[PDB]
Amino acid sequence: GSVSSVPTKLEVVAATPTSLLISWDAPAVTVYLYVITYGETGGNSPVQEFEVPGSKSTATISGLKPGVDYTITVYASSKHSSRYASPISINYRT
Amino acid sequence: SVSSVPTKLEVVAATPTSLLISWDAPAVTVYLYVITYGETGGNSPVQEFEVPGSKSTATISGLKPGVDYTITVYASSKHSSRYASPISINYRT
Amino acid sequence: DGDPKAQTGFDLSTATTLFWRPVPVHVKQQDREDVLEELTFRILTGVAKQNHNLRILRIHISSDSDLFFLHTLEVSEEDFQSLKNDQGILVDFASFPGKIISLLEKCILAQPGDSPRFQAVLTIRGGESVFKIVEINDFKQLPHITLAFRPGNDSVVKQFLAFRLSEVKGTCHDLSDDLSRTRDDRDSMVAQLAQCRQQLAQLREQYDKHLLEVQ
Amino acid sequence: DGDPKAQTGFDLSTATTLFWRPVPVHVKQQDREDVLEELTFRILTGVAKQNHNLRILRIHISSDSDLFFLHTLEVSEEDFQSLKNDQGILVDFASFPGKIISLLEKCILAQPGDSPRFQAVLTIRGGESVFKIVEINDFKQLPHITLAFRPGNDSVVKQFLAFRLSEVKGTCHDLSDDLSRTRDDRDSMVAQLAQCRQQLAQLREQYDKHL
After folding, report:
1. Which residues contact residue C130 at a Cβ distance below 8 angstroms, ignoring those fewer than 6 apart?
2. What is d(CA C47, CA D174) in angstroms, rounded to the nearest whole number?
3. Where in the cell is it found (chain D) (predicted)?
4. Rounded to whole angstroms, how far apart are CA atoms C207 and D11?
């Protein structure tokens, strides 16, 4: 029973105008690492990626513009997946 | 006209294996502090470590539990004095 | 990433991270009893700063508890041929990290009751180290793969210390900000208990006045 | 010495520290405004790993305020003659660090209203730096001594990073103690106001019952 094991429950638990912290329940497969990509929705904002170890279910993003809707994507690195495969995305407006 | 020595040396926090000491600084400008810890009258080599002058506190680790140690702070104060004007305490964990 | 200086050797900017998570491993020292620490591992593939046509694999063993315990392993494609002939490997350079990560996954998911049970062990001889994955069968502890680790170059150690320092400084800064918020909450709660006790004392005075009226 | 390793040069194990304290210094950059930031200094005397008969003086300028900062200066006994002839020094090699420390102390203890007032200024030119202690009298800003600084080898940077990391770890333990104290005190304030409001409501209810 090999689930694709994408991350579930992607949510922003705490948020301040310049920084937010996201938490996700971990997929059932052993996760090698997580690649979190935060970017502004549309516009000329480049997509920014930073890597977090697989054991961590939380992360923090800083440097955000106030009052702007951002798109946050969590890529999971499983055994039978690619570290830019199996993504799940949410949208949040700081 | 001034002590040029440290004044108040006491143990603020203590754990069975390590100790933390705090001292009030002399009025003169302190260049640095040399903290020397050794076992009391025992054949343990005296261990010295250096701390900046801005620090009024320090921490010593690697101690043997239940053994009375002698801790001395040498001040490198003005007038080029070094390993001089010491203040000493004895404390057992 | 980190403080920019002379980085001749492995180009960390062009690095590609493959594996980065804690994994439980037994550590062997002559003086220290063997301790099961989920040492953090990190596997990276990339190219050298001198030449981009040469591929290089990198493995780092770090310790979130004791951050002075760093060990590194670098493998070039030619050294990969040498290692493949020495240990009898059959896969190519590209599939080497995949098999290493598969063995590490077998190590992490090992339950106390499993046959055969895969485990990881690191023997530390001074600055040097030897890491090996073992199979505990009903018969013997047979080694699957044996790897040697060395102290890192001064540059890679510099940048690793810089990364950890940045993370710890950020954590302490966030905690100090929350403590400022807690001090504001303390001030508000103070003022509130003070006003509440003032009101209660006033009501007691009114009750005493009513009792005097009754008498 | 945290994370030690041997490269042929200055033997930090055999080093003797003479001065290590924060010093107020004006920092000047070509594209940036001049800011008075309290930089930490380090003075070291010792011998080289190659030969113990050769003495070497070492000066480190670090910044506990910023995130990463280190500049180094090495003076050999042979180079000291050149520096002494260039800047017109009169003391010997042994008293050179003593006079440097005396000038630095005169600089730190400088009060806003004093003539002459001693000050220290560091000009950063890309990777290199020029440090000079100056005297501002009623007439002019005359330089007492001028010293040149460059970045450092990877080893000294490694040990500086280790020291900074240890300092931040100690601060984090102090911070955990402070957070325990402050949150327990806030909770105490909450629970006491809650008990007081409960008593106030009870007494008001009793007053309504009696009336």
Report:
1. C122, C123, C146, C147, C148, C149
2. 43
3. Cytoplasm, Cytoskeleton, Microtubule organizing center, Centrosome
4. 81
Please state the domain extents for chain C: 1-164
Cis peptide before C116 (omega within 30 of 0): yes
Documented resolution in Å: 3.7
From B44, B35, B33, select the one nearest B67 (Cα to Cα). Answer: B44
Q: Which long-range contacts (CB under 8 A, 24 or more apart) does D28-33 make?
A: D28/D121, D28/D122, D28/D123, D28/D124, D29/D123, D29/D124, D30/D125
What is the 8-class DSSP label of residue D48?
A: B
Q: How was it solved?
A: X-ray
Q: Hey, which bits of D50-110 come out as E strands?
A: 55-62, 70-76
Please list every residue in chain C whose beta carbon sits closer than 8 Å to the beta carbon of residue D162.
68, 161
Amino acid at D187: D
If we measure between CA atoms, which residue out of D196, D211, D193, D197 comes closest to residue C207? D211
Q: Pull the structure tokens for residue C203.
A: 């009501």
The chain C residues in contact with chain D (CB within 8 A) are: 3, 5-6, 67-68, 151, 154-155, 157-158, 161-162, 164-166, 168-169, 171-172, 175-176, 178-179, 182-183, 185-186, 189-190, 192-193, 196-197, 199-200, 203-204, 206-207, 210
